[PDB]
Each structure stands twice: as structure tokens, then as C-alpha cells.
Amino acid sequence: MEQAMRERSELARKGIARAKSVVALAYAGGVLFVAENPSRSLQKISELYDRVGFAAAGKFNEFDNLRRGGIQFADTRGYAYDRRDVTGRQLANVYAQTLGTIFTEQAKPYEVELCVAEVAHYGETKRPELYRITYDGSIADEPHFVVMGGTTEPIANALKESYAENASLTDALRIAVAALRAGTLGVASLEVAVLDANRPRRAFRRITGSALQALL
Amino acid sequence: MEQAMRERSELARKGIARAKSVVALAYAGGVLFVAENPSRSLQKISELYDRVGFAAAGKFNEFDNLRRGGIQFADTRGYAYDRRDVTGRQLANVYAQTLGTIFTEQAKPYEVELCVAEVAHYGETKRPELYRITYDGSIADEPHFVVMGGTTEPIANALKESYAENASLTDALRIAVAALRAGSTLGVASLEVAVLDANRPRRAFRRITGSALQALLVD
Amino acid sequence: MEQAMRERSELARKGIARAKSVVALAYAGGVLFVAENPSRSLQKISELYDRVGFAAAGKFNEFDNLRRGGIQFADTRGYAYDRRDVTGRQLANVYAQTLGTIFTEQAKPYEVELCVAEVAHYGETKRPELYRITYDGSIADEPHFVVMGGTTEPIANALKESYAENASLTDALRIAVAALRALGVASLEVAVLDANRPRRAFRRITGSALQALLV
Amino acid sequence: MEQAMRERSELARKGIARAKSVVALAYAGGVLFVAENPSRSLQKISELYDRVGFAAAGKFNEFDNLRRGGIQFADTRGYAYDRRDVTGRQLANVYAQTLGTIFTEQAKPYEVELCVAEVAHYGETKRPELYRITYDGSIADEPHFVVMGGTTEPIANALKESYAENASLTDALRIAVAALRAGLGVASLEVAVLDANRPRRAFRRITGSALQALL
Amino acid sequence: MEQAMRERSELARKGIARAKSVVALAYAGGVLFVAENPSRSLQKISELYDRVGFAAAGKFNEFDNLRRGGIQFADTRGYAYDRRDVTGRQLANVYAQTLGTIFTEQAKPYEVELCVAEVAHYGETKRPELYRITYDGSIADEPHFVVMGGTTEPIANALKESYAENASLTDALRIAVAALRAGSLGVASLEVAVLDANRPRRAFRRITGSALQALLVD
Amino acid sequence: TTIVALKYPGGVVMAGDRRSTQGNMISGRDVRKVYITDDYTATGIAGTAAVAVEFARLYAVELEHYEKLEGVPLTFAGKINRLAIMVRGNLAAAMQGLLALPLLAGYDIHASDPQSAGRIVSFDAAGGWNIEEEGYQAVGSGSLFAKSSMKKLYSQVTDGDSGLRVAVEALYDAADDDSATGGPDLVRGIFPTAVIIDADGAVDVPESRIAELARAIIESRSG
Amino acid sequence: TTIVALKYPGGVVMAGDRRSTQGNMISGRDVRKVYITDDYTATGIAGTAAVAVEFARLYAVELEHYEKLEGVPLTFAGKINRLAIMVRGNLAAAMQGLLALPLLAGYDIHASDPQSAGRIVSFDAAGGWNIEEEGYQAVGSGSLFAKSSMKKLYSQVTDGDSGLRVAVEALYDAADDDSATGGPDLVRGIFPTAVIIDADGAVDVPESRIAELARAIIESRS
Amino acid sequence: TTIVALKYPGGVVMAGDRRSTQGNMISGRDVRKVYITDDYTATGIAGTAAVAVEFARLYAVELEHYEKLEGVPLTFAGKINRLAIMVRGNLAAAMQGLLALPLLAGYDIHASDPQSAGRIVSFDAAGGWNIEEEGYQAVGSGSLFAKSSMKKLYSQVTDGDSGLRVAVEALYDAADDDSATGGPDLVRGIFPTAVIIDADGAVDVPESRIAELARAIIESRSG
Numbered sequence A: 001m002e003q004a005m006r007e008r009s010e011l012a013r014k015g016i017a018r019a020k021s022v023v024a025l026a027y028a029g030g031v032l033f034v035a036e037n038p039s040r041s042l043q044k045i046s047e048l049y050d051r052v053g054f055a056a057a058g059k060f061n062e063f064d065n066l067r068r069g070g071i072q073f074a075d076t077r078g079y080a081y082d083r084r085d086v087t088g089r090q091l092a093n094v095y096a097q098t099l100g101t102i103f104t105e106q107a108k109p110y111e112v113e114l115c116v117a118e119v120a121h122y123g124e125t126k127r128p129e130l131y132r133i134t135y136d137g138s139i140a141d142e143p144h145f146v147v148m149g150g151t152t153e154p155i156a157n158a159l160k161e162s163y164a165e166n167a168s169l170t171d172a173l174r175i176a177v178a179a180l181r182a183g184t185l186g187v188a189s190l191e192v193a194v195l196d197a198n199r200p201r202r203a204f205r206r207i208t209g210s211a212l213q214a215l216l
Numbered sequence B: 001m002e003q004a005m006r007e008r009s010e011l012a013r014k015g016i017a018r019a020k021s022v023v024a025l026a027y028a029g030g031v032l033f034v035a036e037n038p039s040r041s042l043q044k045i046s047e048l049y050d051r052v053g054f055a056a057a058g059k060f061n062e063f064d065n066l067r068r069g070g071i072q073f074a075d076t077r078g079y080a081y082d083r084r085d086v087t088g089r090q091l092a093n094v095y096a097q098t099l100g101t102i103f104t105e106q107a108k109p110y111e112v113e114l115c116v117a118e119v120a121h122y123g124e125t126k127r128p129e130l131y132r133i134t135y136d137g138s139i140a141d142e143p144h145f146v147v148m149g150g151t152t153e154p155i156a157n158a159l160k161e162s163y164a165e166n167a168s169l170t171d172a173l174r175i176a177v178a179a180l181r182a183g184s185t186l187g188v189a190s191l192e193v194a195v196l197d198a199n200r201p202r203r204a205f206r207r208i209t210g211s212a213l214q215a216l217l218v219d
Numbered sequence C: 001m002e003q004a005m006r007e008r009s010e011l012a013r014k015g016i017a018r019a020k021s022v023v024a025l026a027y028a029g030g031v032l033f034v035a036e037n038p039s040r041s042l043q044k045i046s047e048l049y050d051r052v053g054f055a056a057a058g059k060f061n062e063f064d065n066l067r068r069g070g071i072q073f074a075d076t077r078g079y080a081y082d083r084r085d086v087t088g089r090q091l092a093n094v095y096a097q098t099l100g101t102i103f104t105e106q107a108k109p110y111e112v113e114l115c116v117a118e119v120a121h122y123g124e125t126k127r128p129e130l131y132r133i134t135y136d137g138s139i140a141d142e143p144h145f146v147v148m149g150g151t152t153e154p155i156a157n158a159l160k161e162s163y164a165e166n167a168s169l170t171d172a173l174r175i176a177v178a179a180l181r182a183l184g185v186a187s188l189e190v191a192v193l194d195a196n197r198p199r200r201a202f203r204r205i206t207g208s209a210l211q212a213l214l215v
Numbered sequence D: 001m002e003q004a005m006r007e008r009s010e011l012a013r014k015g016i017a018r019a020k021s022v023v024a025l026a027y028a029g030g031v032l033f034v035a036e037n038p039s040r041s042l043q044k045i046s047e048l049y050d051r052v053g054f055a056a057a058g059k060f061n062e063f064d065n066l067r068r069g070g071i072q073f074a075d076t077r078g079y080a081y082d083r084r085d086v087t088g089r090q091l092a093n094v095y096a097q098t099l100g101t102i103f104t105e106q107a108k109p110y111e112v113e114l115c116v117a118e119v120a121h122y123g124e125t126k127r128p129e130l131y132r133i134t135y136d137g138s139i140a141d142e143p144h145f146v147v148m149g150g151t152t153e154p155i156a157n158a159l160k161e162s163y164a165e166n167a168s169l170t171d172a173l174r175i176a177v178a179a180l181r182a183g184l185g186v187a188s189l190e191v192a193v194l195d196a197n198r199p200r201r202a203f204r205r206i207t208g209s210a211l212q213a214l215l
Numbered sequence E: 001m002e003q004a005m006r007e008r009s010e011l012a013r014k015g016i017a018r019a020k021s022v023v024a025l026a027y028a029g030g031v032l033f034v035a036e037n038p039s040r041s042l043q044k045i046s047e048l049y050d051r052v053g054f055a056a057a058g059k060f061n062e063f064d065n066l067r068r069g070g071i072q073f074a075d076t077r078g079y080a081y082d083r084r085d086v087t088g089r090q091l092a093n094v095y096a097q098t099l100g101t102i103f104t105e106q107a108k109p110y111e112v113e114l115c116v117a118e119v120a121h122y123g124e125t126k127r128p129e130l131y132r133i134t135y136d137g138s139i140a141d142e143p144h145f146v147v148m149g150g151t152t153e154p155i156a157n158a159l160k161e162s163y164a165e166n167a168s169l170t171d172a173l174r175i176a177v178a179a180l181r182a183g184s185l186g187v188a189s190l191e192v193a194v195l196d197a198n199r200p201r202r203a204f205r206r207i208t209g210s211a212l213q214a215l216l217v218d
Numbered sequence F, H: 001t002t003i004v005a006l007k008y009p010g011g012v013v014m015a016g017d018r019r020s021t022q023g024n025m026i027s028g029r030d031v032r033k034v035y036i037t038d039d040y041t042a043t044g045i046a047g048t049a050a051v052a053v054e055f056a057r058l059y060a061v062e063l064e065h066y067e068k069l070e071g072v073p074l075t076f077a078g079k080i081n082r083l084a085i086m087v088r089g090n091l092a093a094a095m096q097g098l099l100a101l102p103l104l105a106g107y108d109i110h111a112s113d114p115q116s117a118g119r120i121v122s123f124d125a126a127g128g129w130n131i132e133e134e135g136y137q138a139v140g141s142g143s144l145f146a147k148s149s150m151k152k153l154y155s156q157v158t159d160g161d162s163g164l165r166v167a168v169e170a171l172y173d174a175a176d177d178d179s180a181t182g183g184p185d186l187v188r189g190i191f192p193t194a195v196i197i198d199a200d201g202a203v204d205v206p207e208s209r210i211a212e213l214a215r216a217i218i219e220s221r222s223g
Numbered sequence G: 001t002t003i004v005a006l007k008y009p010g011g012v013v014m015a016g017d018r019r020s021t022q023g024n025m026i027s028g029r030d031v032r033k034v035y036i037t038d039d040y041t042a043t044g045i046a047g048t049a050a051v052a053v054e055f056a057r058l059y060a061v062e063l064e065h066y067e068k069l070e071g072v073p074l075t076f077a078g079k080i081n082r083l084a085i086m087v088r089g090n091l092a093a094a095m096q097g098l099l100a101l102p103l104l105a106g107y108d109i110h111a112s113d114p115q116s117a118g119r120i121v122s123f124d125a126a127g128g129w130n131i132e133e134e135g136y137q138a139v140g141s142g143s144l145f146a147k148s149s150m151k152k153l154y155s156q157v158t159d160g161d162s163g164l165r166v167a168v169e170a171l172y173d174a175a176d177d178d179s180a181t182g183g184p185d186l187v188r189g190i191f192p193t194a195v196i197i198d199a200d201g202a203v204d205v206p207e208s209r210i211a212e213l214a215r216a217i218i219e220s221r222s
């Protein structure tokens, strides 16, 4: 019982420690998602709902499964009730319950770590929210940013002495890349997106290619 | 089998050991829940029914599952009969049953400790009731205070020394938080506080946050 | 197999051994249930049917499950046939079957010991019946008293050397509480199956009435 | 495979050996069941059908299970065709199949040993039938007597010595209680007979003043 | 995997070894079934279909389950098609398949050994057929006789040395009895039946009491 | 079909005719419509023959089933309940043409007063039941003729003989006014059937007795 | 059929007639339709007999089931809700002809003023229910005649015996105008049944008092 | 039955009559048809009493269930959606006679302009819903008379007092032209019920206030 749960826990921990690192930060325009991604078409950051986004680290097919599950939950709930009733708190709750269930019952625990972020609706003033859920359904609330995947503490340190609230997007991505290096990164090695609280409906937006090149 | 149940009991006990402490007190205005919680949006205390409240210590996803199951049980029972046939003792009973089944049958035992509290309906005279449900389905009725989570014996022994019946909300809050820290610097950023207020006419559960909580803590 | 049954029998036996004790006795007015119970709102003794009562020792949620299953059995059987077709022997039998199944097939065996009692219907002369069902579903009929839970030997012997048939209510209460101490209102739960009642025999004895009965 | 089946067969063997013994003999009036039973309410000998009777040894809830199952099978068979098509051999057969499945596939094998007897119908002249089914589904056909439970060897030997065909009811009863004595009054015995002299229902219980008078 | 099949084959085989012996013998009148049986009403030999009979050795409830299954298969097929389509080869085949599944997947293997026999339909000239199906589903085609249960070597050699195809019912009977005695005996301890090729439809016929006693002595 | 039942001091008697029709054709002359369902209860049925036989067989099997399982027979109330539940079970087929009503007559060994322990229970297609408290009851196409005859003949009931006779005469009147109820057949020797139930149990009345009472009625109406 | 119920200072009373018909024929003279469903609750029913008996038996068994399972009886709103749910459950059979409606009368032990603790609840086929706050109610084929009599005779209700007399008189009028409602049978000695519920519970009214009240009414209308 | 709802600057009012009919017979004089379903929402129903009560109770239980599970009440749009789903689920029963239509009044605390945060939603048997943007609405058998009265009286609404006044007068016209809608009973003292909702929440209007308005209306119609 206990040694089996610690074998699972360690399998997931070592799995995540071997995967690439991901950072999600709060800035004056919303939320910023930066991840080391060599792929051209496989994504680690994605849209969940109008003002709610998703970042993940670990084995791809597993956090992709979880991403599809969260999209399904969000759409179904927004249909059953209203679109305004979907909150990042709800998706972090459901992700917690789901990852706990997978960790305790699945044939192999999921070697993933997820972040669910929510920004304010258009015309509303409300500071962003970031939640981090680990492989056993542990859930944590973070006011400034979330680092998950790979060797984390080095990135966390750089952020601890480089983060500034209400930073510009052009400053915030530069900071994020700096923290990722501690642990040269260019457009061909990165995937980035933002929750743009200035957007009327859907806040998620990818920053790709020539626009990302110009940004950096 | 016997070894399996032993290490399940140990896994749950140790899980609750590493958990932050929650206490619930009977006082003049009803019942007060105070909990060590640094979070902003993840709550450990919640409304169950009109005059029934809920406190939990341990793993969040698990006692949140149990919290939702309790709300489901209470609402369904109230729709099948009347709102007044829903009692705190019922919720404590079905919580004992459910945590027994969970403890023996689920893939992993729930690392949770529960407290269900009931105050009097509006205008009625009845001393509050407090029930504690253990990770293994053990249920116990206790008349004054309930401590759950972490190293409990310091906190409980503190409440044994400094509890007074019908103490003001300020007094009960100071005594609760004093016992909390005595079991182990706290404040509004580290506490989740609510009350079952026997003075409200319908829904007795009420959160005390922000400026009001600051005004209540320090006087 | 033999190892698993060894561990189930031992787990249930120790679990029942750690629990408080309950005594049931026949007396001139019916059946007396006396149980060590410090709780205010939680019961070890319960009505099952018109003239049939239930007492339990062990883990609360488990014998409360069994108690509710007994109420469902008795009410469903009475509605299916008639109220006078429901007997205490029936409930004892179904408790033995059910408890055997739990003991062999559930994840953990129930750590409970159950007693079903039955008095006569109003205006009839038949002697009370006491049934004891153990954790493995073994059933036994006693003529005088039933002891369950905890260290049963001193209580059993005490009753064996103090019991007299057709004792008065107060005598049965003193002999029972004396047998247990081997204890006031706030640490006892007491109820009777009163054969003198016309419709429902079960009634609790609590508070000032119980205090007047104690001394 | 050999480990499990070994452990199961020895668990059931130990269970049966620890229980009280039952004896059934064919006498001039039909079949006589006598069982060591100190219970006033719990029965080990039962009726299955008009001319078919049942006697069990071992764990009560388990052979009461098999008992109700046999009554069900019998009544259903008689309703699907006619009462006359129900035979003691049928009951013994389905008991062998049932106890086979239980012994190989259940959580814990049943600690029971069954006996099914048949007398002739009223106007007919047919020698009685005695079937003994064991815990592993083994079925044996016996012409004179059947012994179950406890240490069977001294009882089967005392019967092998003292049994004669066509004994009277009192002879059979006394030689039976004697064979039980080799390993016992009204208060500690349960006695019944399948009486071939009855027109419809052969099963009859000998209790109280009548059983005392036969001793 | 490997240990499980070893203990399964050993359990079933030894289980059949501790049981009583059964002999099925092709003779001039059809097929003859002789089995050691102390019981008066419990049977190891049985009818399956018009010209197809059944014999079994081992644990009673198990080969009785297989017996009832075989009767069910025969009656169902004969109803779905025609009685003339039910053959001994079909019964033996479904027994091989069924016993294979039992041996592989039951909680405990069946400690049984089956023989299925078929004589010709009335008025036709077809030599009898005897099939042996063992505890693991192995099916074997045997020419004159089949021995099942107990120690089959003495009985098998006795029959191999004293067999006559065109022997009479009495002759073949006392031959089979002599072989059963060689592998270790009157009416009170024998179950005897026959697939009689001369009966018009149902060839199965039991041989009981005074008739069998007349068949044992001259 | 006509079934009659009535209480007498210390017991109860039930009787039924022997006719079966379909349309206007006589299709049966010796039908048994009254069944002994257990040692102290008999039920007589009127209606679709198949449903009636199923009722009686399944009901007797049900009672003896409970008795063998629990070691004690059902209380009379429980027996009433099971019979009613069975009828309610057949309600649908009855609505589509397979209708059959039972009449229950029993002796309650657990009744307080042993001479008023006779019991008459009537039923309807929906499972409703009523314990009759007026002494007599009937069910069938001639039940109102027989019931109105018993309304006048009941005061003569004082033991088993008188009650049996007024039962046979109620059946006689019913058969006299209802072509679907058969009277005594003196050419064939076929007479109505009857069960009588006392504290010693339920026993069939021999046919020759009903023949005697039948002839007595016939000549009593000749002159 | 006609069931009546009315409130009096300190309790409530319910009474029903004894008649069963089938079309025009009299099929019952002794039918008992008012049931003591629990210590403080009495139910009267009108309609199909099988549905009625099922309603009463199953309902009382349900109330006691809850009382024994949870150690406390239902609140009165709970009892109402359960009964209404059962009646709603019988709506298909009701549409096909197996119709029966209950009338509820109980004494609420948790009511504010013990004098106004009487409760009368009428029900319809779809499980709709109404707590009657005008004092009296009736159900059945004669319910309009009994309600229209109680309208004029309610002012005379001042205590238990007077309310019982008004209930028996209302049943008398219902039987006077509705051939499906049975009146007092002076020859056979069969009279309406009645249950009365006060702070001490629900008890059967003895037949002799009903008979005397009925004789007074008959004598007064001659 | 007639239920009325109308908007006023800063809130919404909803009132309903007290009559229950069964064909032409008056089966109820004090029915309460307007329910507070949460602190800012009130539902008034017309139609079969059983379906109306089930709608009110199940709807309130549902809303409070959501806010207890999620720690935040539903948006008003979500409340509309759930109510519409519940109404749609009853369509089969409604085609067989058990028809009930609700009417929704609320105060959207999340509205941009609190002066016009008042909300009125009407529904049909198909679950189709409409947020009313012309000030008033009414459901029931007298709903046409009520809407046509409010069409002439609405220009008088300038606050909560005039809104309640106009509402009670519309109910008065409803009962004036519809026999299934109940007017003020000055003998029994029974008047329509009302709920008012603003930024402080939803409260039941006391009886005496609606009685005052009713008396003023009656004496206005008498002169």
C-alpha cells in the first residue's frame, strides 16, 4: 500500500524531472506562457475557455489527454449553465480530482504537472489567478507565476529576483527566457502564448513566428 | 488483509499528520470554524445545509469530494422531505458510513478528518452539536470543541484550558487562534474563518473575511 | 485461504474486544438493554419491529449499517405478508446469513456483535427470546442474558452468579450495571422491550426517569 | 492449485469435525432423524418435499442457505411439472452440483455435510433412500444409516454393530441416541421422522412430552 | 503459467486415478458398458441420443454436469436440424472443446474421463465407434474398447488378450468383468448398459437385477 | 360458474358447481373449482380456467413454501395479502380477457374466539380484498342469485350440516337462474363439490353427501 | 364515499362512512376507511379499494420506517410531501381507472400555538396538495354535500364532542344526497368511523358515541 | 391564475392571485403562487398545482445547490438556462394535461447599470425563453387582460411603490375579466401576494400593503 504509492509517486516525480520546463507568469496585460518546445506542431500550452488557459509539463499524450478532458468539462459546463460560470478555480478543482483519481487507480500514474490560469473579463478589473496541480492531485494557488517540469528550483530562483508585477509583455518574455536558461533560447526552441485581458471574448492568443521574432 | 488495513490506517494517519489544523468551537452566537489556510480560493470550511456547517483537514481533493457528497446528500434529503428533517447528526452518520466504505474499499484510503456542526433553527433554543468523523469512519459526538489535523494534543489541551461557554465571537476567535498557534505568526492572510450564526433567520453559514476579520482578531 | 480466514477472524475478534460492552436480559416486564455509551446522540440499541429489539457492540458505522438493513428487512417483510409474521428469529437468521457473507467476502470483516430480542405481543404469555450473532455469522439462542463486546468473561460470570428470573425492572437495571463494572446516566444508554405495551414494545429510559431507576 | 484446494478441503474438514453430530436411520415406519441440538429455536433437520427430508451438519448459516435453496429447487420443480416428479435423488444430485461449485469457486468453502432422505408415497411400497453429500460435492448412497459431523467413526461403528432393519420407532430412537452417546435428553436433542404412514406430508417433528415419552 | 498447468494436469490425472474403473466394449450386438458402481440410483453410464451412449469415470458431480451438457447439445442440435444429423463424432468433439476450456479456465479442473459410443442405425451395417475424451480435452479414436479410471494397464492388457469383436452379450460381459477384476464383483456392485444395434430407435438399454444375474452365471 | 362460502359455528364451508361453457355450448360437466390450499384454507375461483388453475396451484405452493422456509405458516392476514398480490399481478391479462376472481374461506387457528374463527374473504380484479362480516359470500355469474338465496336461508345455519345444505341450495338457486352454472346431474351422478373447514382442518365433502342434499332439495321443491 | 375532517380548539377530527358500491349494487356495509397512520396522523381515503389499502398500509409503514431509521419522526411537511409523492406515483393507474384520493388530518407536535396545531391536507390525482386553513374539508362523491353542510354547522364547533357531532352530521347529509355514501344503519348497527387527534395523540372514537350522536340527528330531523 | 411582473428604476416586482379552480368549482382561496427562489430571484407559476410546486422547490434547491457546490451563485443567464431546461423536461407531461408555465423576476447584481438591472423572463412549454425588454409581463389565464392593463398603466411606474400599485391593479383587471383569477376577498381578508427585488435583495411584500392598494383601487372603481 504505502510502498506502492511511493513507487508511483517517485515514478511520476522522476518522469517530470526528466521533462522540459514550463513557466506561466502574471504581467500587466494578463498571463504569459513560455515553454521550451522543440516541436513544430505539438503543443504544451493551450486554450481552455474564454479567459482560462492551460500549460503542462511531462509525457505528452497524458497531459494532452488531461487537456482534452478539461476542454470537454469547460465546454459542457458552459453549455449547461452560462459561459461566465466557467472559472479557472473550477478547472483547477476538476483537474485536482482527476489527477488524484489517476494517481490512485490508474495502471500507471500520469507523469504530468499542470497549470490553469485565469485573467479578468473584458472591461473588468481583477488580478490574474494561477493554479498548479501535481501528479497526485495536489493543488496550489500562486499569486505571481508557476514553474513546473525539469529542474525547477533554478528557474524559480531567477523568477524570485527577476519578477516585477505589472511588467510589460516585452519585459516579461525576456525575464521568462532568462529564468528558463538558468537550468541561448530562440524562437525555434520556444512556444509562447498569452491570456490577453484586453481581448473582448477569447483571451488566449499564440505568439508565433515573425511576431515572436519581433517580440524577441 | 490485516497488514493491508494496518498500512492503510498508517497512510491516512500520517497524511493527516502533515496537514494544517482546523478547530470548531461552540459559543454564544452559534459555532465558529477557524482553520490554518494560506490560500485565497481553496476553502476548507463550507456550508452544508441551512443550519449545518462543515470543516475538514487533510488532502484537499479528497475532503472536497466528501464535501460535495455531503451537499448532495443534504439537498436530496431536503427535497425528498422537508428542509427541517435534515439534521447535522444525519450528515455525520452518512459521513461515518461513507468514510468506512472509502477506508476499506477505495484504492487509497482518504487522508481526511471531518467535522459536522449544527446550530439551532431561528428562534429555537438548542445547544450546538459537533461531530468528528475519522478517516476510518469513526464518529464521535463532542460537546464543546473539535480539533482536526496536524499535532492535535497541544491545541486540544489548550482549548481544554481556555474554553468558556457562551463566549463572545471575539473571545472565541482569540481562544481558537491562540490554541492554534500554541500547537503551531498568523493573521488574516493565514486563516479561513466562518460561523454558523444562530441569529440568521434562514441560512446560518457566514464567512468573516477581510476588514471584518481584521477588526475581530485584534481589539 | 487458512491464512486469510485466520486474519479475518483475528481482526474482527480484536476489534470487538476493544469496543465497549452491551448486556441484554429477560425480566418480568420484558427485555432490558443496557449498554455502556457515553455519547449523547449515537445509539447502540434500537427498535427493529413491534416486539423485536436490536443491540450491538463494536464499530459504529458497521453495526449501524446492519441495523438499518434489519429495519428494512422487518418493514419489507411485514408489508409483504403481515406485521405478525415478522419474528425475532427471522431477524436473527437473516443477520447470521448476512454477517457470514460480510465476513467471507467483504474487503474487511465487520467488527460487530449483534443481539436480537423479542417479547410477547400484548395480552399473550410467551417467554422472551434472546439471539446472539457473532462477527462470522454464528448464531446462538440464549434463555437469560446476552453479553457482547469487550472483555465478556467477568460480565458473563457476574450475571451467572447474580441473575434471577422474572426480576423487577429496577433489580434488572442494578444487576446489569453491576455486571458491566467488571456508570451513571451520562455514560449509559438503557431501553426496554416492554411486553405491557399494546402496539410498539420498544421504549428508551433516559434522564430523570433513568436516574430514579438507578438508585 | 494443489495449495489452494488442499487448504480448502482441510478448512472444511476441520469445520465439520468441530460440529455436533447427526444420525439418520431407516426404520419400519420410514426415516428417523436425530441431531444433537441444544437450541430451542434453531433447526438442523427440515422438510424438503412431501416425502423428502433434510438433515445437515456444520455451520448453521451455510447449511440453512443450502436448505432454503433445496426447498426452492423442490417447489419450483414441482410447480413446473407435478409434485410426484420430485425425488430425493434429484435433491441429492443438485446438492452435489451446488456443493461442488461452492467448494471450488466461493470465497470460503462451506463447512457443511448434508443428508437427504426419501420415504415412499402413501399407498406405495418402496424401501427408503438415504443420500449423504459432502463439502466437496461428493455424493454417497447409503442403505441403512447416515452419520454427519463430529468424530463420525465411533457412531458409524456403534451403528454398524447395533442396527437392524425394520426396528420400531422406539428401538430406532434409542439405538440412535446410543450411537450419538459414543462420542442426551429431550432438552439437548432435535428429533423428527419422515413417516411413510402419513398421506400427504410425511415430515413430522417429535418434541416435548411425546419425545420424552419415547425415551 | 508452467507450474499452474503442472498442478492442474496432476490434480485431474490423480483424481481420475483414485476413482473406480469403467469399461466400454464393442461386441457383436453393439456396445457394452460395464462400470464398478456400488450405488443403486447414482449412474456413471447414460443415454445421450438415439444410437449414442455415454460413460464416465471420476468425480460424480463433474462428469454428471458434462453428461447433462452433452444431452443438451444432442437434443438442441437434433431439434435445430434432424435427429439423423446427431453423431457420436459431434458429441466427442464438443466434449473435447468443452473439457479443454474447463481444464484451461475453471477454478479447478474436471477430474473426469469420458467415453462416447455410437452403434449403427437400425437395419444398417456400420461398425461401432468409441471415442475417449480425457481431462484436458485430448480426444482419441479407439477400435474395440475403452478403459477409464483406476489403474487402466491391467484391465487394458486383459482386454487386449481376451477380446473378441463378435462375442455375445454374455461373453463380452464376463470378459469385461474379468478384466475389471484383473484391475483391482456381482450385480450389487455393477452398473451395466448396452447400445443395442437391434432396437428400432433408442439403442440404449440398462441391464438390471435378475436379468444381469442371469447374464453373470450360466 | 358460481362459488359460495359461508361461516357456521366453529367452521366454514365452500362449494362450487361443475359447469364449463364457452359461448352457449356446455364444454365441461365435472370441473373442480374449489381447492384445498392448505390444512386450514380453501379457495374457489371463477373465471378463465387457465388463470384459475394457475392461481390455485401457485397459491398452495406459495403458502407451503413460506411454511417450509420459516418453520411456521403465514398468519391469515398474510395469506390474504399474498392472494391479493397474485390477483393484482394478473390484472393486465384480466384487462385483455384472462379474468378470474378467487374466494377465500379459512379457519384462523390464531383467532381469539374458536367458534367464530371462520373467515370469508372476497377479492376483485384490482387486488382489493374484503373480509366478509355478514356470514356468506359468493363469486361468479350466479353469485347474486346464490347470495340473495343465502340472505333468506342463512338463519337456518347452526352447524356444519345446515350450513352445507344451504350452500348446496344456494348453488341450486344459482344454477336455476344462471345458465352458466350447473345444477345437480341425476342422470350422470355429478354434483357440486364442497370443502368444510373446522379446528381439525380442511376436508373434502364426499360426493354422495352432496347427492343426498341435492335430492332432498329437488323433492323439497317438487311436492 | 365521503371522508370529512375538521379542526376544533386543541385538535382535529376525521370521520368516514361504511359503504362500498360497484355501479349501483351495494358491495359493502362495514368498510373502514379512516386509518391511524401514526401517533399524530390519520388518513381517510376515497376511491378504488386496492389503491386505498395500499396507500394507508404503505404510508404508515413508510412513516414508521423513517422514525426507526433516523430516531426521530418526520416533520409534518415531510409527511405531506411523502403522501403527495405516493399519490403522484399512482397517476398512471389513476388515469386507467384505479383512482383514489386521500385526505390527511394530523396534530403537529412542533406547531407554535398548541390550540392551532390541527392540520388538514387535501390532495389531488397529480400529487398536488393544499393545507386547509378554513377549518374543514371532505373528499369523495359526497364531499360537496358534507362541505356545504359543514359551512353552515361549523359555528357550533367549540370543543371535541361538538366537532365530532358536526362531523357525523355532515356525513349524514352526504349520505342523504349521495347514494354512494352510506348513512347510519339503525337495523344492522353499523355507523361511521372516526378518529380524533389531540396533544395526547390519535385515538379511535368508540362506536357507542357515534351511535348516540347519529340517533340525536335522526330524532332531530324527524 | 394570473402572475404579473414589471420593472421599475432599480428593481422588479412580481405579484400573483390566490385562486385555485377545478373546472368551474373553486378549490382554493389562499394559494401562494409567487416564491422567492433565491436572494435575488423570484419565480411565479401558472398551471397545474403539482407541477408548479415541484418547479418552485426543485428550482430553488438547484440554485442553492450550485452556489453551495461552487461558492458563487449562478449568473442570471445560467439561472434562465436551468429553468428553461426544467420546463422543457416536463413537455411530455404537459401534452397530457400537466402543463405549467413559470415567470421569472430577478435583480442581476452583476449588471453594468444597477438602475436597469431588473430582469423579467417568460417561458413556454417548449423551454423557449425570452428576456422581456418592454418593462412588464404576465403569465396565466388572465395574462392578456393583465398585459393590456399594464400597457395603459405602465407610464405611471416611477419607483417601487407605483410598480406594486400597477401590478396589483393589473391583477385586479385580470380577476375582473377572468373567472379563473381571484380578486381581493374583502370578506375573508385575502389579497394577492407580491415579491419585490432590488439591490438589497428579494422580500415578500406584507399583506397589509397590498390590502391598502386593493382598497384604493376598489374605491377608485366605485366612484
Ligand SMILES: Cc1cc(C(=O)N[C@@H](CC(=O)N2CCC[C@@H]2c2ccccc2)C(=O)N[C@@H](C)c2ncc(-c3ccccc3F)[nH]2)no1
Residues within 6 Å of the ligand: F001, F019, F020, F021, F022, F027, F028, F031, F032, F033, F034, F045, F046, F047, F048, F049, F050, F052, F053, F097, F098
Ligand atoms: C384466451 C383464451 C380463453 C379461453 C377460454 O375461454 N377457455 C375456456 C376453457 C376451454 O375451452 N377448455 C378446452 C380445453 C380445456 C379447457 C377446459 C374446459 C373445461 C374445463 C376446464 C378446462 C374457459 O376458461 N371457460 C370458462 C367458463 C371456465 N371453464 C372452467 C373454468 C374454471 C373455473 C374455476 C375453476 C376452474 C375452472 F376450470 N372456467 N381460451 O383461450
Ligand SMILES: Cc1cc(C(=O)N[C@@H](CC(=O)N2CCC[C@@H]2c2ccccc2)C(=O)N[C@@H](C)c2ncc(-c3ccccc3F)[nH]2)no1
Residues within 6 Å of the ligand: F122, F123, F124, F125, F126, F127, F128, F129, F130, G001, G019, G020, G021, G022, G027, G028, G031, G032, G033, G034, G045, G046, G047, G048, G049, G050, G052, G053, G097, G098
Ligand atoms: C379496475 C377495478 C375496479 C375495481 C372495483 O370496483 N373495486 C371495488 C371493490 C369491490 O368490489 N370488492 C369485492 C371484493 C373486495 C373488494 C372490496 C369490497 C368492499 C370493501 C372493500 C373491498 C371498489 O373499489 N369500490 C369502491 C367504492 C370502494 N370500496 C371500498 C373502498 C374503500 C375506500 C376507502 C378506503 C378503503 C376502502 F376499501 N372503496 N376492481 O377492479
Ligand SMILES: Cc1cc(C(=O)N[C@@H](CC(=O)N2CCC[C@@H]2c2ccccc2)C(=O)N[C@@H](C)c2ncc(-c3ccccc3F)[nH]2)no1
Residues within 6 Å of the ligand: G122, G123, G124, G125, G126, G127, G128, G129, G130, H001, H019, H020, H021, H022, H027, H028, H031, H032, H033, H034, H045, H046, H047, H048, H049, H050, H052, H053, H097, H098
Ligand atoms: C391530472 C390532475 C389535474 C389536477 C388538478 O387540476 N388539481 C387542481 C388543484 C385541486 O383541485 N386540489 C384539491 C386538493 C389539492 C389540490 C390543491 C388545491 C389548492 C391549491 C393547491 C393544490 C389544480 O391543479 N388547479 C390549478 C388551477 C392550480 N391550483 C393551484 C395552482 C398553483 C399555480 C401556481 C402556483 C401554485 C399553485 F398551487 N394551480 N389534479 O389531477
